[PDB]
Amino acid sequence: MTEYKLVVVGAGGVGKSALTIQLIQNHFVDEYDPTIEDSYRKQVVIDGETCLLDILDTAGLEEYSAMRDQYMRTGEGFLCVFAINNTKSFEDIHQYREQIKRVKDSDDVPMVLVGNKCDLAARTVESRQAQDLARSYGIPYIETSAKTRQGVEDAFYTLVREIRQH
Numbered sequence: 226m227t228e229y230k231l232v233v234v235g236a237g238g239v240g241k242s243a244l245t246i247q248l249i250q251n252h253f254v255d256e257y258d259p260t261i262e263d264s265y266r267k268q269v270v271i272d273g274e275t276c277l278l279d280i281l282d283t284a285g286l287e288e289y290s291a292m293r294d295q296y297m298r299t300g301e302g303f304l305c306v307f308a309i310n311n312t313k314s315f316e317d318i319h320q321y322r323e324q325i326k327r328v329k330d331s332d333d334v335p336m337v338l339v340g341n342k343c344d345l346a347a348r349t350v351e352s353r354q355a356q357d358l359a360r361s362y363g364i365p366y367i368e369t370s371a372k373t374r375q376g377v378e379d380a381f382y383t384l385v386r387e388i389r390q391h
């Protein structure tokens with residue numbers, strides 16, 4: 226069983242926890258709304274191979290976290306999350322990517338750009354603008370909704386596949 230260390234990053238309120246919880250939930254607990262950074266596990270079959278995903282749900286750069294740098298050093302792939310109704314969260318993406326490049330000292334870190342809250346009509350970030358940004362980084366772009374579950378599995382499994390193809 227191959228293990229993968231994934232890190233979910235992005236501005237406050239974009240849905241980092243909602244995404245993580247939606248992927249890892251075994252549903253015993255009805256509602257889980259995390260208030261703190263934490264690590265979660267999910268065993269899943271991706272392309273025949275049993276994988277163990279360790280998913281770290283991180284705080285936005287606005288919050289202090291002592292272990293942030295070691296989180297990046299450890300992390301093997303990164304979900305870079307913004308919300309399609311929050312232009313500022315989208316502009317903030319450059320900060321998340323620079324931090325990862327600075328800590329890991331590499332241009333070629335596995336990453337997926339994630340446009341969350343795609344269930345909402347009040348869109349301020351056009352899909353094509355986010356496609357252009359991902360293309361400039363050389364990474365996949367996937368839109369997700371943590372409410373409907375749309376794209377949630379696809380975003381994490383694409384990140385895994387990015388790690389493998391690295």
Ligand SMILES: Nc1nc2c(ncn2[C@@H]2O[C@H](COP(=O)(O)OP(=O)(O)NP(=O)(O)O)[C@@H](O)[C@H]2O)c(=O)[nH]1
Nearest residue numbers: 236237238239240241242243285341342370371372
């Ligand atoms: N409509 C909609 N709301 C969402 C979606 N994902 C999360 N939310 C909502 O957006 C808010 C923030 O979600 P949350 O998961 O806490 O985001 P976060 O990035 O972990 N926040 P924090 O940085 O403070 O930890 C919550 O009210 C949550 O229910 C989504 O896909 N669609």
Ligand SMILES: [Mg+2]
Nearest residue numbers: 241242259282
């Ligand atoms: Mg959170």
